[PDB]
Amino acid sequence: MTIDEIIEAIEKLTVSELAELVKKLEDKFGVT
Amino acid sequence: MTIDEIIEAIEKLTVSELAELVKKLEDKFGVT
Amino acid sequence: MTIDEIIEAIEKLTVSELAELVKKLEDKFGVTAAAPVAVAAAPVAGAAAGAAQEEKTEFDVVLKSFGQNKIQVIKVVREITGLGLKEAKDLVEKAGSPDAVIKSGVSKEEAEEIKKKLEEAGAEVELK
Amino acid sequence: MTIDEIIEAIEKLTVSELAELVKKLEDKFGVTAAAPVAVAAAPVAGAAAGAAQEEKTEFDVVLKSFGQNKIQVIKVVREITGLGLKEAKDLVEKAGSPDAVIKSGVSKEEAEEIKKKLEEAGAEVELK
Numbered sequence: 313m314t315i316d317e318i319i320e321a322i323e324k325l326t327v328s329e330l331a332e333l334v335k336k337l338e339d340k341f342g343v344t
Numbered sequence: 345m346t347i348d349e350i351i352e353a354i355e356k357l358t359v360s361e362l363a364e365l366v367k368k369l370e371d372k373f374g375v376t
Numbered sequence: 377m378t379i380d381e382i383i384e385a386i387e388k389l390t391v392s393e394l395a396e397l398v399k400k401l402e403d404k405f406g407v408t409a410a411a412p413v414a415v416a417a418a419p420v421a422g423a424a425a426g427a428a429q430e431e432k433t434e435f436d437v438v439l440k441s442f443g444q445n446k447i448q449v450i451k452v453v454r455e456i457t458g459l460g461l462k463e464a465k466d467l468v469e470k471a472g473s474p475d476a477v478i479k480s481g482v483s484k485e486e487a488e489e490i491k492k493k494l495e496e497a498g499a500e501v502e503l504k
Numbered sequence: 505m506t507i508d509e510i511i512e513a514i515e516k517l518t519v520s521e522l523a524e525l526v527k528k529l530e531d532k533f534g535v536t537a538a539a540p541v542a543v544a545a546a547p548v549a550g551a552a553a554g555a556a557q558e559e560k561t562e563f564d565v566v567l568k569s570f571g572q573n574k575i576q577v578i579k580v581v582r583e584i585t586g587l588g589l590k591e592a593k594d595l596v597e598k599a600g601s602p603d604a605v606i607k608s609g610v611s612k613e614e615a616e617e618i619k620k621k622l623e624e625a626g627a628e629v630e631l632k
Contacts, residue, residue, distance in 0.1 A: 313605040315397040317591040318385050321377045322401070322413065333379045334416045337386070341419035344534050345477035347525040349463040350513050353505045354529070354541065365507050366544045369514070373547035376406050377588040385586035392553035392562055392609025395519050399550025407543050415535045415542045421549075422527025425520035433611045434520055458513040460505035481520025483561045483611070 386420060391428065391481070394421040425481060435487040435503050436480030439471040443498035452497050453478055456490060471499070514548055519556065519609070522549040553609060557632075563615040564608030565622065566630045567599045573626025580625045581606055584618060599627075 325333065337343075357365060369375075377385065389397065394417050401410035428434040442449040450468045453459065456479060459467065470476040479490055484503070491501040505513070517525065522545050529538040556562035570577035574596060582592045584607060598604040607618055612631075619629045 313603045314385075314585045314587060314595060314607060315389065315393050315400065316603065317585075317587050317595055318382060318389075319397060319400055319404075321382050321385075321588075321591060323404075325379070325382075329379055330412065333382060334412045336379065336383055337416040337420060338535060340383075341423060343416075343419055343530060345475050346457045346459065346467060346479060346513070347517065347521050347528065348475065349457075349459050349467050350510060350517075350525060351528055351532075353460075353463065353510050353513075355532075357507070357510075361507060362540065365510060366540050368507065368511055369544040369548060370407060372511075373551065375402065375544070375547060377591060381586070381588055385588075388584070388586045390562075390607065390609030391523050392519050392556060393607070395523065395546060395549035395553040396609075398546040399553075402543065402546055411539060411543050414546050415530065415539050418523065418526040418530060418542050418546075421519075421523035425523040425527075428520060433614060434518075456516070458509070458516040460509050463505060479518065479521070480524075481518030486561055 386417065389420075389424070391421050391424040394424065429480060429504070434481045435484055436482070437478045437487055437490045437494065438474070438502045438504055439468065439476040439478055439494070440500040440502050442468050442471045443500065445498040448497040449494065449499040452493050456493075468499075514545065517548070517552070519549045519552045522552065557608060562609050563612055564610070564632050565606045565615055565618045566602070566632055567596065567604040567606055567622065567627055568630050569599050569628035570596050571626045571628070576625040577622065577627045580622050580627075584621070 398414050398417055401413050429436060446468060450464045453468055454464045487503045491503055494501045526542050526545050529541050557564060578592045578596045581596055615631050619631055622629045
């Protein structure tokens with residue numbers, strides 16, 4: 313499934329990349 | 345709204361109560 | 377995929393896919409380790425939830441009036457939502473107000489089933 | 505309300521409602537203090553997302569085949585999902601498989617719309 317494609321991409325990310333993904337999403341949606 | 349009714353109920357909870365809401369929810373959905 | 381490429385893919389997911397994705401990360405990685413995606417994606421799903429209400433891909437049931445059977449309208453609300461008494465009477469008594477939303481994120485069909493079960497209680501409902 | 509009561513209400517929410525509930529807490533409390541509800545609710549929403557699929561209140565698009573147009577079909581999947589090449593190819597190649605789900609949690613119309621575009625590129629699609 314598509315989400316399974318996204319999950320596999322996320323778990324291949326380094327801990328710095330996961331953190332960058334997290335930082336960006338929260339940023340774009342105005343998170344504090 | 346209905347969700348607002350739940351939120352107002354949640355923010356009234358004490359930290360100990362909130363912790364119990366969370367365990368239970370996680371308990372009921374096989375959380376680890 | 378790029379981080380940005382993954383963010384745009386995540387941004388295209390339905391509210392249900394995002395929920396499933398997260399639930400799937402929690403089971404696989406544990407609540408603690410999966411928490412970063414859980415909190416990072418909730419705003420995205422919240423956005424999708426709102427975009428679905430504005431694109432009419434999902435609807436909600438707004439209470440325009442509880443009529444002459446406030447208590448009977450509140451009954452159906454409790455049955456539907458599960459709210460306790462105080463809170464249910466609080467929501468019902470907000471009728472006529474734009475946020476007297478009994479339920480949202482439902483299908484037209486389900487919205488119709490709710491609108492009717494509410495009207496059968498002598499209340500005026502509006503499906504948005 | 506009781507905690508057991510609050511919990512029962514949350515189990516009555518739609519995926520969209522839970523999503524919006526979590527997001528409001530995050531905007532209200534911040535990602536760190538709202539985290540507990542975010543993580544504890546995701547499974548609840550995941551369960552609701554699966555329930556919607558089973559009750560046919562939400563639909564998914566399943567690829568039964570891509571035919572001689574593997575490339576063009578992957579182009580549409582990439583268009584619809586934002587998946588990158590590798591990942592898109594992976595999913596498309598899963599055609600015929602139960603988990604060749606291109607998109608789910610969509611409305612019948614959206615599902616139809618998607619089915620159309622995929623069939624247009626040479627694929628055989630099933631809506632569930």
